Each structure stands twice: as structure tokens, then as C-alpha cells.
Amino acid sequence: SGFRKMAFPSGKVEGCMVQVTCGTTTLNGLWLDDVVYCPRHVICTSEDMLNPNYEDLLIRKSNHNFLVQAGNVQLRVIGHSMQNCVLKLKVDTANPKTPKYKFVRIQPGQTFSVLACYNGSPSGVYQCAMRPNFTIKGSFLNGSCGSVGFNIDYDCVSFCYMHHMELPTGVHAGTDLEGNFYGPFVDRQTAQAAGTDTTITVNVLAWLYAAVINGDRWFLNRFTTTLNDFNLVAMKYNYEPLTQDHVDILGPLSAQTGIAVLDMCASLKELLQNGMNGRTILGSALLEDEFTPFDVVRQCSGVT
Amino acid sequence: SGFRKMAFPSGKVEGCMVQVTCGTTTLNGLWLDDVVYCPRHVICTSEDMLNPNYEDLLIRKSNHNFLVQAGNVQLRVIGHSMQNCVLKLKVDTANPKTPKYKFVRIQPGQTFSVLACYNGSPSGVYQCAMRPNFTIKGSFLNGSCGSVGFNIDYDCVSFCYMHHMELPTGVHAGTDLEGNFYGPFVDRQTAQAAGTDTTITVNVLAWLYAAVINGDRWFLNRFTTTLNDFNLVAMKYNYEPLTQDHVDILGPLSAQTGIAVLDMCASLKELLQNGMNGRTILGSALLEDEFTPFDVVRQCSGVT
Ligand SMILES: CS(=O)(=O)NCC[C@@H]1CCCCN1CC(=O)Nc1cccnc1
Ligand SMILES: CS(=O)(=O)NCC[C@@H]1CCCCN1CC(=O)Nc1cccnc1
């Protein structure tokens, strides 16, 4: 009973967080095996951030200039390299708490947990989604850079995000663990505006299935629709187009509830056109889109 | 930038979760020092749950009937006792991962993180609040009993909740770590209806301060009110009465933003009377009440 915005247990990732300092800038690093990954903007001063030339700035940096501390103990840096927008600091000690891990690059609409850190110390964990405009709506202050996003499949942590910046509008941008930004963003203090933050339709549908499974059924109507008809309405409301791949992904939820995917689309179409009328669904007055179909199945089945 | 429903990092609590089985019932236990705490209903069969006599049922149980497994290894039970609605199983091994801890009994309106577990294995973490009717709106399935709620102050985990049951309406009830239920609930499969789930006014105000700090200011109006005038409106909307103690607790948020607490009350009064008009505050279409003033300060300051 009940449906909550749930993050993965963060323990495995807490065991990887370290503090990285270069000059007067301190941010977070991810320590996996004998490598510490961190945003390359750790080498910048506030005056460098306006138009940094990372290759040039890195020439003035040596291994001993990167101070890495895990807990209250210092790690010895024996190498450093830049891969895209991340620095990889080779240390002389493999992280004894390194979990089984992968680096994955997620697609928009995919959700993940963020372990927000400051000074290499965890402050909290929350669930995010990669928006269709490649931003994330996180909760990050100065010092949170290097905090990571991840998913866990039993005992393997798939790291998908590393926090790099906040845009002037308060939304967030970062990279995968190979240092490639999600979206068109760059690690520079410049005019970077996000595109349209459309709603992740397949995720809203998954959450409507979660509401039916949990007893919230008032929005179920007597209508059906087609993908093309639904998509005409979805476009109008700034919702992402629904594809047959999304319908296939919702199949297990459709099977468990006996509600055909296109019927749920028609209910969603009426919610968009009529509004909620002061009513709530799973304690929310808006259509939640940061639960994937996989998250709904996992939460409704108790996957550990 | 940004404000998220954030849970505490769960690592310290993950190191305490064990599986407890008695007969055909398997639930979760909390292993701190050489004691495993778990709901006493682990001794019940589905036929016992209708009108259980826990003292009588416990007579038929011996130490060897409680199977405790931490990871894939079995713990030896050398004693057992019932304290209120929890069982304390003494084991021969102190939990090597026992963090610094306290057992606290929270008041309604207080928030906490829940590490939802099944078979002693963590599945997810989310943030909850003890409702004014002493229920919690969690996400718990069969097997989640024994999952705990907690707060962390630097390195000391204060355990405040242990999950025991779901009411027929899908809301949740549990105890503190001394086995005393929050509210009038009992660990019996019987007619237990919750009282009015009023809104935690002081928490809504704290979240409105968080919205102002994060740029969402559209709801700020040109009015002020008094505690008595505000409370007349609060009663009408099923909001908890606001006291001078709550005003004092909001003082740091009032100071940081320069918005007098009573002025924020007047903004909240207008939001109640006029509604949101299709607008959102911190990405929500309803007034969020599961952030305490302390949570707002902690998140807005980056406490680790
Ligand atoms: C906001 S801006 O005028 O576009 N300049 C961004 C500043 C630089 C641009 C280059 C990379 C470092 N940031 C710092 C940064 O974004 N820190 C931060 C703070 C809060 C939340 N998240 C991260
Ligand atoms: C729902 S009732 O008809 O009031 N009976 C409650 C059953 C017994 C009553 C006595 C204690 C054990 N529960 C089982 C229980 O609530 N399990 C569960 C399941 C999902 C979420 N959370 C917990």
C-alpha cells in the first residue's frame, strides 16, 4: 500500500565519496578502484570560469596539486588525466568499498537517485529524472559538484550522472561518468538556456497505473484513444510523443491491472483537457512524470 | 538551487538490517549492538492476527525458533523478550556496523527517512512525516514490517519508527523503538480507522520560505495577519493550529528571507482561500507539509 518517490539505498555510493580540492576550490569526487572521478572545473578559480581553457589550465597542475581526502585520511595522487569534462585522478589505493559498478549514459525520461554531497560527505538522497531538455531538477548548492546519480540492479551500481553546474534558471546540468555532458551544456559561466521541459508521457502513464494499483481510480474513464489521437493532445500540452516502444514497456502494468495502455492514454487525455478539478492522484495535484514503468514495477513488487 | 524531498543517506541503517523469521512469517529486524529489534507480530500466523494474545503465543516460542540472518550468515539467538509491541532478540554477536544511535519518540509533524526493506534487504529510501493523526503515508508491501524510520545528526542515527501495519485505508502505523505505537493503533487485524489527516501548518510555512529562497515568489502578497486570524482560516481548511512555538521555530527562515512569519501566514491564508489557480510552487500544485523548518534550513545550507 502506498506509493512514494523512492531513491535507491545510498550506502554503496556513500562508500565512494571523497573530497577533492585544487587550489581554493573544493568539490566532491567518486572513488572507484584506484581512480577518483571529479568535474574538471575543480582546477578553475571564479575568474577562470568565464572562458576557461581546460587544457591550458591543466598544464599548471601536477598530481600533488589535487588534494583527495576519504574520510579524514589523505589519498596519494599518482596520476591525472582529463576525459571530456571529468578529471580522473589515479590514486595509490584501491577503494576498499568499491561496489560492482558500471558507467551508463541514460536517455531523457530515465530516473536515478542522487546522493548530494558537500566536502565529500553525504547530506541527502533524492530521486531525479533526466528531463527531455537534458537538464535535471535537483537540489544542489555551491560545493555539491561531483555528487553523482545512479541506479542499482541488485548489487551493481550503474553510475549515470555527475553534477557539474546550475544554469541561470536554477536547473541543473552534468555529465555521464565518461565526462560527456547531457544535452548541449558546457562547463563555462555563460548564457546557457534550457529548451522546453516537456512532460515524460510514458512515466505519467506508469504513475497512473501505480495509482490504480494503490486504489486511486477516480480518473479512470469510459474512453479509449489511438496513439495518433493521443499524440495530437500530448503535443498541445507539451507532453513527449508516445511511441509503440513506450506502449510495449507499459505492457506488464497493463497486464497486472487489466487496463489497456490506450485506455489509460484516454484517461490521461481527459485529465489534460479537464484538469484535476481540485482532486489528487497518489497525494499529488499534478501528473507526476519522474517514475519510469520499471520504477513502478519495482516499487509495487518490492525488488531489493 | 532547487528544493527536493530529500532523505538522509541510508548507509548507516543499511548496515543494521537483518531478516527475522518465526515459523512461516519473515519480516525485517534492526540489529544494534547484540540486540535485534522486530515487530512482535512475527510470531503470528494469519489466523493469529485476528485476535492475538502475544504473551500466550510467545510461550510457545524459544530462542531457536527466531531465525535471524544478516546477509547470508545466521546469527545465534541467546535470548528474547517482548517490550510493548517489539521483540528484542539478543544475539551472540554485536553488529560490527552499529552506528552511534538513539531511540527517539517523535511528535506529529516531524519528518524522517524510511529505509523500506524486504527479507532484511534494502529496497529504497524515502522521506515521511508523522501525520497529525499518528499515521504515516509510506510505501510498504507484505514483508516490509520491521523497516525503520530515522533521522541523522552528523554521525548519530536517531531511530524513531518501526513499521508494523497497514490500516484498511492504505495508510501506515507503527511504533517507536521501545515498541509503543504512534497513535491509538494496535497490532491486530481489526477495524482501525484513522482520524483527520490535517495539514502540518508550520511545515507548509517552512516550505513556502524554501520556495522564496529558491526563486518561487509569485504567491507573496501585500498582506499580514495575526495568529488568531490565521488560525480561524487554518481550522476551516483542516490545517493544524499555529502556535507561538511554531513562529519561534520559523525565526531563522524569517531572518534569512526578511519575510515576517505573520506575513508568510497571510500569503498562506490567501493560497488557501484563492487556490493555486493552476500555478505551482517548487514544482508542486499543492501545499507541501512534509518538510520541517529544520529540514528547510538543513537543505538550504548543505548540512552533511
Ligand atoms: C549560474 S551561471 O552564471 O551560469 N554560472 C555557473 C558557474 C560555474 C560554471 C562552470 C562550472 C562551475 N559552475 C559553478 C556552479 O554551477 N556551481 C553550482 C552551484 C549550485 C548548484 N550547482 C552547482
Ligand atoms: C489491513 S487489516 O485488515 O487491518 N489487517 C492488517 C494485517 C496485520 C495486522 C497485525 C500486524 C500485521 N499486519 C500485517 C500488515 O499490515 N502487513 C503489511 C502489508 C502492507 C504494508 N504494511 C504492512
Strand, helix or coil for residue A138? coil
Instruction: Map out the domains of chain B with their CATH numbers.
Output: 1-14+100-197 (2.40.10.10), 15-99 (2.40.10.10), 198-301 (1.10.1840.10)
Query: Cell triple for residue B57?
Result: 503465543
Mutate to test the interface with A, among B123, B273, B274 (most CBs of A within 10 A): B123
Query: Cell triple for residue A65?
Result: 596539486
Residue B117: closest CA among B145, B137, B89, B85: B145
| Cα distances (Å, whole numbers) of residue A112 to A126, A234, B131 | 9, 25, 28
Residue B288: closest CA among B127, B114, B116: B127
Residue B292 Cα to ligand 1 middle (Å): 28
Q: What is the largest CA-CA distance in chain A?
A: 68
Nearest atom (ligand 1) to Cα of A142: 19
- Beta partners for residue B36, in sequence order: B31, B89
Contact A137 B276 (CB under 8 A): no
Residue A90: closest CA among A33, A158, A40: A33
Nearest by CB to residue B304, choosing from A4, A10, A119, is A119
Check if B186 has its Cβ closer than 6 Å to any atom of ligand 2.
Answer: no
CA–CA distance, B123 with A295 (Å, rounded to integer):
11
Query: Cell triple for residue A282?
Result: 497518489
CA–CA distance, B201 with B238 (Å, rounded to integer):
10
| One-character DSSP codes across A20-78 | EEETTEEEEEEEETTEEEEEGGGG--TTTTTS--HHHHHHT--GGGEEEEETTEEEPEE
- The residue written with cell numbers 485529465 in the block is A271
Render the burial of B236-268: b for 16+ CB within 10 Å, e for the rest.
eeebbebeeebbebbebbbeebebebbbbbbbb
CA–CA distance, A47 with A23 (Å, rounded to integer):
13
CB A272 within 8 A of CB A239: yes
Contacts of B2 in chain A (CB under 8 A): 137-140, 166, 170-172
Contacts of A276 in chain B (CB under 8 A): 285
Torsion of CA B259, B261, B262, B267, to 10 degrees: 60
Residue B219: closest CA among B271, B148, B169: B271
Contacts of B301 in chain A (CB under 8 A): 141
Query: Cell triple for residue B149?
Result: 524510520
- Phi, psi dihedrals of residue A221, rounded to the nearest 5°: -115, 180
CA–CA distance, A77 with A182 (Å, rounded to integer):
28
CB A145 within 8 A of CB A28: yes
* Cβ atoms within 10 Å, residue B65: 14
Contact A171 B2 (CB under 8 A): yes
- Phi, psi dihedrals of residue B69, rounded to the nearest 5°: -130, 125
Distance from CA of B227 to the nearest CA of A (A): 27
Nearest by CB to residue B286, choosing from A170, A172, A280, is A280
Residue A2 Cα to ligand 2 middle (Å): 13
CA–CA distance, A201 with A92 (Å, rounded to integer):
47
CA–CA distance, A51 with B162 (Å, rounded to integer):
53
CA–CA distance, A244 with A250 (Å, rounded to integer):
10
Query: Cell triple for residue A244?
Result: 509503440
CA–CA distance, A69 with A19 (Å, rounded to integer):
5
- The residue written with cell numbers 489528487 in the block is A280
Contacts of A6 in chain B (CB under 8 A): 116, 123-126, 139
Distance from CA of A56 to the nearest CA of B (A): 30
**Which residues contact residue B243 at a Cβ distance below 8 angstroms, ignoring those fewer than 6 apart?**
B227
Contact B275 A276 (CB under 8 A): no
- Phi, psi dihedrals of residue A7, rounded to the nearest 5°: -100, 165
CB B7 within 8 A of CB A7: yes
Query: Cell triple for residue A184?
Result: 548541449
By the 10 Å C-beta count (0-12 exposed, 13-18 middle, 19+ buried), B148 is classed as buried
Query: Cell triple for residue B93?
Result: 554477536
3-state secondary structure chain B: CCCCCCECCCHHHHCCEEEEEECCEEEEEEEECCEEEEEHHHHCCCCCCCCCCHHHHHHCCCHHHEEEEECCEEECEEEEEEECCEEEEEECCCCCCCCEEEECCCCCCCEEEEEEEECCEEEEEEEEECCCCCCECCCCCCCCCCCEEEEEECCEEEEEEEEEEECCCCCEEEECCCCCECCCCCCCCCCCCCCCCCECHHHHHHHHHHHHHCCCCCCCCCCCCCHHHHHHHHHHCCECCCCHHHHHHCHHHHHHHCCCHHHHHHHHHHHHHHCCCCCCECCECCCCCCCCHHHHHHHHHCCC
Residue B242: closest CA among B253, B229, B255, B252: B229
What resolution, expressed in A, was reported for this entry? 1.6
Question: Best of B85, B161, B166, B172 to mutate for ligand 2, by most ligand atoms within 8 A of CB?
Answer: B166
**Protein residues whose CB sits closer than 6 Å to any atom of ligand 1:** A 41, 49, 140-142, 144-145, 164-168, 187-189; B 1
Query: Cell triple for residue B226?
Result: 495575526
CB A115 within 8 A of CB A10: yes
CA–CA distance, A200 with A183 (Å, rounded to integer):
16
Query: Cell triple for residue A281?
Result: 492522484
Query: B121-129 and B111-118: which strand pairing?
Result: antiparallel
Interface A:B, Cβ pairs < 8 A: 157
Alpha helix positions (H), A142-217: 201-213
Given its phi and psi angles, is residue A205 left (phi above 0), alpha (psi -120 to 50 degrees) or beta? alpha
Query: Cell triple for residue B62?
Result: 524459544
CA–CA distance, B5 with B20 (Å, rounded to integer):
31
Query: Cell triple for residue A213?
Result: 494499483
Going by CA atoms, what residue is nearest to atom 6 of ligand 2?
A: B189
Contact A9 B6 (CB under 8 A): no
Chain B, nearest residue to A296 by Cα: B139
Going by CA atoms, what residue is nearest to atom 19 of ligand 1?
A: A142
CA–CA distance, B130 with A126 (Å, rounded to integer):
19
Please name the helix (run of DSSP H) or strand (run of DSSP E) that holds residue A125, with its range, or none.
strand A121-129
Please name the helix (run of DSSP H) or strand (run of DSSP E) that holds residue A102, with its range, or none.
strand A100-103
Check if B49 has its Cβ closer than 6 Å to any atom of ligand 2.
Answer: yes
Residue A106: closest CA among A254, A241, A290, A304: A290
Obtained via which technique? X-ray
Check if B34 has its Cβ closer than 6 Å to any atom of ligand 2.
Answer: no
CB B174 within 8 A of CB B181: yes
Distance separating the N- and C-terminal Cα atoms of chain B: 17
CA–CA distance, A238 with A243 (Å, rounded to integer):
15
Is B80 noted as a catalytic residue in this protein? no
- Beta partners for residue A299, in sequence order: none
- Beta partners for residue B158, in sequence order: B102, B151
In Å, how far from its chain's centre is CA A134? 10
Residue B127 Cα to ligand 1 middle (Å): 28
CA–CA distance, A105 with A84 (Å, rounded to integer):
14
Torsion of CA B287, B292, B294, B299, to 10 degrees: -50
Contacts of A124 in chain B (CB under 8 A): 4, 6-9, 299
Which amino acid does the sequence have at B168?
A: P
Contacts of B294 in chain A (CB under 8 A): none
CA–CA distance, B304 with B301 (Å, rounded to integer):
9
Check B16, B44, B128, B145 and give the catalytic one.
B145
Contact B284 A283 (CB under 8 A): no
Q: Which ligand is nearest to the CA of B187?
A: 2
CB A99 within 8 A of CB A12: yes
Query: Cell triple for residue A122?
Result: 553525504
CA–CA distance, A293 with A210 (Å, rounded to integer):
9
Going by CA atoms, what residue is nearest to atom 11 of ligand 1?
A: A187
Residue A269: closest CA among A225, A217, A238, A228: A225
- Phi, psi dihedrals of residue A286, rounded to the nearest 5°: -130, 160
Nearest by CB to residue A304, choosing from B122, B137, B299, is B122
- Phi, psi dihedrals of residue B81, rounded to the nearest 5°: -150, 160
Q: In which order are the strands placed within the sheet that holds B86-91? A: B73-75, B66-70, B17-22, B25-32, B35-39, B86-91, B77-83
In the structure, how many helices (H) and strands (E) does chain A have?
Answer: 8, 13
Contact A172 B1 (CB under 8 A): yes
